[PDB]
Amino acid sequence: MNVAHYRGYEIEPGHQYRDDIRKYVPYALIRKVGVPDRTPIPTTYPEFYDLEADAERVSIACAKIIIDSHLDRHDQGLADLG
Known part of the structure; x- marks a missing residue:
């Protein structure tokens, strides 16, 4: 199960x-x-x-939504990554 890239971000489904x-x-x-x-x-x-x-x-779809929402909405999640 290799990680998939998304908007420059890696995703680890599980x-x-x-x-x-x-x-x-x-x-x-x-x-x-x-x-x-x-x-x-x-x-x-x-x-x-x-x-x-x-x-x-679902995790793959959620990861994309969280990464996209993080950049747009300040849900505070991937702040450590940027």
């Missing part, structure tokens, strides 16, 4: 559950090409998915 919601939700890691050595910011989205495969496809 799935993981948080103990805060004890549920499975789109979990992916984004790394910037200019400075990927910076702490990664896990991507998440308000929703739940029983299937891990569904989380992988």
Whole structure:
């Protein structure tokens, strides 16, 4: 599972559950090409998915939305990457 590039940002599709919601939700890691050595910011989205495969496809769409929203809207997320 190689990372896919997006607007110059790398995406790491995957799935993981948080103990805060004890549920499975789109979990992916984004790394910037200019400075990927910076702490990664896990991507998440308000929703739940029983299937891990569904989380992988959603994580890719969420990562793009979070990266795009971060540059436009100040949702404070990839601030460490820039």
